[PDB]
Design a protein around this ligand. Structure first.
Ligand code: A1BAT
Ligand code: CL
Length: 167
């Protein structure tokens, strides 16, 4: 039993809800919130820009130190950093950004990072400003993640189409 509430169940292990991931994380304070990161951990917009804003830029400060030490992530890769006031940990996951010409096949590799965590709050990887089809992203999520994932979809109109088209 967990404190995730109001989710529609899609599979044994995948759940979904129309919700602002920022407001969800503050309410639940999950063990892991997933960020839709880029390789530079520059949290300028999208889910990443919103989460960082909610941390009063502490996420960005921590991220800049991480990059200065370790260099950029790989597309499809991840790192675990602090969750600040939103969660215990933030799993920064880099899905391919179609608006940069990045290979969409790397989306499966990106979702594989979720399997290292028993329970996560997460957005659809490569959706929104990363330019991929959110329906496809949901399919890859369901077919790749085996741990318990609570997907937050910000757009109510997008949320309804995702549910209404799920096979
Ligand atoms: C930008 C943002 C703020 N809070 C959020 N919570 C969950 N998802 C998000 N953006 C990913 C989308 O696919 C959902 C609708 C268009 C992009 C956000
Ligand atoms: Cl977005």
């Amino acid at each position: 039993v967990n404190s995730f509430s109001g989710y529609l169940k899609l599979t044994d292990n995948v759940y979904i809800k129309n919700a602002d991931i920022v407001e969800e994380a503050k309410k639940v304070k999950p063990t892991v919130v997933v960020n839709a990161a880029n390789v530079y951990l520059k949290h300028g917009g999208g889910v990443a820009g919103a989460l960082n804003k909610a941390t009063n830029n502490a996420m960005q400060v921590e991220s800049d130190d991480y990059i200065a030490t370790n260099g950029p992530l790989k597309v499809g890769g991840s790192c675990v950093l602090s969750g600040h006031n939103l969660a215990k940990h933030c799993l920064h996951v880099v899905g391919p950004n179609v608006n940069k010409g990045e290979d969409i096949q790397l989306l499966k590799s990106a979702y594989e990072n979720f399997n290292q965590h028993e329970v996560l709050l997460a957005p659809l990887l490569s959706a929104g400003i990363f330019g991929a089809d959110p329906i496809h992203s949901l399919r890859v999520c369901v077919d790749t993640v085996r741990t318990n994932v609570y997907l937050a979809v910000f757009d109510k109109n997008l949320y309804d189409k995702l549910v209404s088209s799920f096979l």
